[PDB]
Amino acid sequence: NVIKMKSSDFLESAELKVSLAFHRTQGLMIMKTHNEALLEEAKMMNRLRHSRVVKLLGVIIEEGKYSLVMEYMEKGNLMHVLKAEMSTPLSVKGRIILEIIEGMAYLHGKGVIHKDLKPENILVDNDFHIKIADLGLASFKMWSKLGTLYYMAPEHLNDVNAKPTEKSDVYSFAVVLWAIFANKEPYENAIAEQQLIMAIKSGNRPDVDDITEYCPREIISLMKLCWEANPEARPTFPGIEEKFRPFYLSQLE
Numbered sequence: 001n002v003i004k005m006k007s008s009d010f011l012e013s014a015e016l017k018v019s020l021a022f023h024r025t026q027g028l029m030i031m032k033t034h035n036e037a038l039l040e041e042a043k044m045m046n047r048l049r050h051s052r053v054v055k056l057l058g059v060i061i062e063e064g065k066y067s068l069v070m071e072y073m074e075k076g077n078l079m080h081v082l083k084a085e086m087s088t089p090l091s092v093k094g095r096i097i098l099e100i101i102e103g104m105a106y107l108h109g110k111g112v113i114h115k116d117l118k119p120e121n122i123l124v125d126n127d128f129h130i131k132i133a134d135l136g137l138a139s140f141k142m143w144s145k146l147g148t149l150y151y152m153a154p155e156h157l158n159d160v161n162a163k164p165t166e167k168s169d170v171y172s173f174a175v176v177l178w179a180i181f182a183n184k185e186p187y188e189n190a191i192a193e194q195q196l197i198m199a200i201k202s203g204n205r206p207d208v209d210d211i212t213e214y215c216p217r218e219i220i221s222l223m224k225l226c227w228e229a230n231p232e233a234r235p236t237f238p239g240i241e242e243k244f245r246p247f248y249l250s251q252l253e
C-alpha cells in the first residue's frame with residue numbers, strides 16, 4: 001500500500017525539480033514536487049515492486065503541495081557514476097547491463113512501457129547496483145499533467161502520432177549500452193537538433209569506433225541489433241537476457 005505523507009514528517013529539502021529529503025523516521029528519500037484520480041495513479045505505481053525498480057514509497061497530497069516520494073540511491077544516475085573516475089571494470093558494467101534488462105522485463109510484464117529510458121533514469125547505489133526510475137513522469141498520465149532525444153527510437157522522432165511500443169524501450173537500451181562503454185553521451189559532433197533528428201531517422205547511430213575502452217565484439221553486435229530501424233527486427237528484453245546472461249556468466253562472472 002501507498003503511504004500518505006505530510007510535509008511536516010520532513011526536516012528539510014535540497015534540490016538535486018527532484019530533491020533529497022530527510023524523513024523524521026524512515027531516513028533519506030527522494031522527493032519530486034484532479035485531486036482524486038492522482039492518488040489512484042499513485043496506488044497503481046506503488047504496485048511496481050522489484051529489486052531493479054525505484055519504488056514509490058509515498059505521496060504528499062496537501063493544500064498547495066503535491067509530491068511523489070521515492071527510495072534514494074546514494075550514488076546518483078548512471079552517467080554521473082560513469083564519468084566520476086572511469087575505473088568501472090568490465091564485470092561491473094556487465095552486471096549493470098543485466099540489472100537494466102531485468103528491470104525492463106519486469107516493467108513490461110506489469111504492462112508499463114517506460115518511453116524515457118536513459119542513463120539519467122538509471123540510478124546507482126553504493127555497491128554499484130542499479131534501479132530504473134521515471135523522474136520525468138513519462139509513464140504517468142495524471143501526475144505528469146500537473147540531449148533528451150539521444151535515446152529516442154527513430155519512429156518517434158518528428159512523429160508524435162506513433163504509439164510507443166515495448167520495442168521503443170529496446171532502442172533506448174541499445175543507446176544506453178553504448179553510453180555505458182563510452183563513458184559519455186552519444187553524438188558529440190552533432191551541430192543542430194534538426195540535423196541530428198534527420199541523420200538518426202536516415203540510419204545514423206552512435207559511433208561504435210568511438211569506444212576507446214575495450215567493449216567485447218558480442219556486446220557491439222547486441223547494441224547494433226537493438227538499435228535496428230525496424231522495431232520488428234529488435235529483440236525483446238527476455239530475448240536479450242537469453243543471449244546476454246550466458247555471455248556474462250562465462251566471460252564476465
Ligand SMILES: CN1C(=O)N[C@H](Cc2c[nH]c3c(Cl)cccc23)C1=O
Nearest residue numbers: 045054055056114132133134135139
Ligand atoms: C517517479 N517514480 C519512480 O521513479 N519510481 C516510482 C515508481 C515508478 C513509476 N513508474 C516507473 C517507471 Cl516507468 C520505472 C521505474 C519506476 C517507476 C515513481 O513514482
